[PDB]
Amino acid sequence: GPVIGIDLGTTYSCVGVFKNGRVEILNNELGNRITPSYVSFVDGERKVGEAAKLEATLHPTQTVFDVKRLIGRKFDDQEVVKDRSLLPYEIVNNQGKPNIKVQIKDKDTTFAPEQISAMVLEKMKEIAQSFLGKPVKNAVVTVPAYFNDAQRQATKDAGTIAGLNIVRIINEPTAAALAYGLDKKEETSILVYDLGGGTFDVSILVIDNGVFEVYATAGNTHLGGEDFDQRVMDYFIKMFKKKNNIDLRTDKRAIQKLRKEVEIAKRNLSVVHSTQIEIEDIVEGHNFSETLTRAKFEELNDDLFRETLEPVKKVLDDAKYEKSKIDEIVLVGGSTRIPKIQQIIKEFFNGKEPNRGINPDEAVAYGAAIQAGIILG
Ligand SMILES: CNC(=O)[C@H]1O[C@@H](n2cnc3c(NCc4cccc(I)c4)ncnc32)[C@H](O)[C@@H]1O
Q1: Which of helix, strand or coil describes residue 55?
Q2: 3-172+364-376, which class in CATH?
Q3: 68 labelled catalytic
Q4: Which residue has a Cα nearest atom 12 of ligand 1?
């Protein structure tokens, strides 16, 4: 049978196959290589991916996401207490563990995190099956290096529910190191800087004669590209109020349309210096039309960008490493395409350039597919 590779991310998943000596990262049915890790339970229908994420605006309590934050944890863990206060869907205490409670045709229905992760895995499986034109029973799935045995087992149990035998769990730093094809000979120390949509992770990964070991991990569980978008949102909501006497927060639809254009403007500003954010009738009879510059984008987010260095100092300290001891810096996550992020890391490493890919959102799934290939020989 085939073995596919799946990056089960906090905010998104990504699936790759190894076939005819190449890794193919697969498109979902909307033509995207990244699928939002969302599941909606509205109006007697269950949706997974972007179609579910679009329900979050009008049905926030029925639109489940960020389940990776809960999986294999305890209801009373300090992190889960925080996540319950942030997440808009109901989380209940089932015998010491967080479960998700929603309604299906008005009936209360409770799910383990691994039942919701299983639905994401099922969708990635179906993309692979369609593409390979055969059934898929086996996968390599990625986890964060800091995941404990209960978090790993809960991820494997998600696979079993989705009809996937997870033949190997590999950590996200190792997957990145496989994708970038880092030389496995001799000893090299690698700083893997992973800045995603919602989470920041940094790891020191040591490769020694083909053996991969994560010597230290740190991060910020509530720092990612979505926060940079929110800083921009906050700025233009204040401006629109000043100019128009309209508080766009009073209209949830207006906020949804703004967040979509702000996320595009942010991407543009990784390449250009100035971009237009435009929504016709953001509310009836009022257009939104603004310019954002890279300089203002950076100014709005500079403290968040610099916060990413605090986990870098922590892993260098935990590992008793000098900065010079790092041989190579590898960037993962779309947010590492931000020029200021790259500059800040370079300058922290007293001038050393970070290695980055071209598709840093897909590098982990790519490495998971390589690992699948490695396992089949
Ligand atoms: C969607 N998944 C994520 O991990 C996050 O990654 C962000 N994300 C993707 N892509 C980005 C970008 N792209 C410009 C670009 C394009 C090509 C080359 C170069 I240099 C630069 N800029 C800034 N954040 C970017 C998203 O906005 C989420 O928050």
Answers
A1: helix
A2: alpha beta
A3: yes
A4: 267
